[PDB]
């Protein structure tokens, strides 16, 4: 039965050095990002203005086809660079810098992994991106910058060819994940440690990746609660650090001996964005 300190020792001794990381909305809410599942008062109001019946409808095609304004209200909030990474992002950046990151799989669409300096080659934005968009009527693609002015002006962007609503390439319920998701085929059998941070593990097929690592591989969960496949089918080398995600990350940094390198990385990257 492994402890958090055991996992930090495996890393310090380089017994684990090919780390795969899975993250969700829990690592972005410390940055101020509105979690769509738990909206803040201001965002909740603006969404209610257009009769959003429930949070998940923001990412449902039938609702979007009927009324795209709630989605574009949320999209306006997630303009690239309107937010700053937090300690969890910089920890993952430090994992990369120390040569330990095999791949980071994210469900978030805020782009904060990229802002924190984790390279795109190391990232799988499994639920899509605002970098591109697709007409919902004729399926023509566009660069994401082609719709940005409209989105920032509270206008629904429309196709120059057919006038249909153009939708950013965020993966909605029922849509295919991007092909880059298929990096999991080789990545997960290659991982020697799996980290899960700030996700409810309730969206598929992302959640089932937790079962893709070999059974020798410790699965370390840093999360408020034990959730998903980690709860339903535990493995003997699972470790759960249950509580606030930022505090969990900071405890792991302390056990690793990375506290000063973190402090230096934060000041350096805070200097970049200020």
């Amino acid at each position: 039965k492994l402890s958090l300190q055991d996992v930090a020792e495996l890393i310090r001794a380089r017994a684990c050095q090919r780390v795969v990381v899975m993250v969700g909305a829990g690592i972005s809410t410390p940055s101020g990002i509105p979690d769509f599942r738990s909206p803040g008062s201001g965002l909740y109001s603006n969404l209610q203005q257009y009769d959003l019946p429930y949070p998940e409808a923001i990412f449902e095609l039938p609702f979007f086809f009927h009324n795209p304004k709630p989605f574009f209200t949320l999209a306006k909030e997630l303009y690239p660079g309107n937010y700053k990474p937090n300690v969890t992002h910089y920890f993952l950046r430090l994992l990369h810098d120390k040569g330990l990151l095999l791949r980071l799989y994210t469900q978030n669409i805020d782009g904060l992994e990229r802002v924190s300096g984790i390279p795109a080659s190391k990232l799988v934005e499994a639920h899509g991106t605002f970098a591109s968009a697709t007409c919902t009527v004729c399926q023509r693609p566009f660069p994401g910058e082609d719709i940005r002015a409209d989105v920032m002006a509270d206008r629904v962007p429309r196709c120059p060819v057919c006038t249909g609503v153009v939708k950013p390439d965020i993966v909605f319920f029922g849509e295919p994940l991007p092909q880059r998701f298929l990096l999991h085929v080789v990545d997960f059998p290659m991982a020697d440690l799996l980290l899960i941070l700030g996700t409810s593990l309730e969206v598929e097929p992302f959640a089932s990746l937790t079962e893709a690592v070999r059974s020798s591989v410790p699965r370390l969960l840093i999360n408020r609660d034990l959730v998903g496949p980690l709860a339903w089918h535990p493995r003997s080398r699972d470790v759960a650090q249950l509580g606030d995600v930022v505090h969990g990350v900071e405890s792991l940094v302390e056990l690793l001996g990375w506290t000063e390198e973190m402090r230096d990385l934060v000041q350096r990257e805070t200097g970049k964005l200020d």
Binding site: F172, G174, P176, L177, E204
Partner: peptide, 7 residues
Amino acid sequence: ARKSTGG
């Protein structure tokens, strides 16, 4: 592989 939830 299509995105889903609840099952």
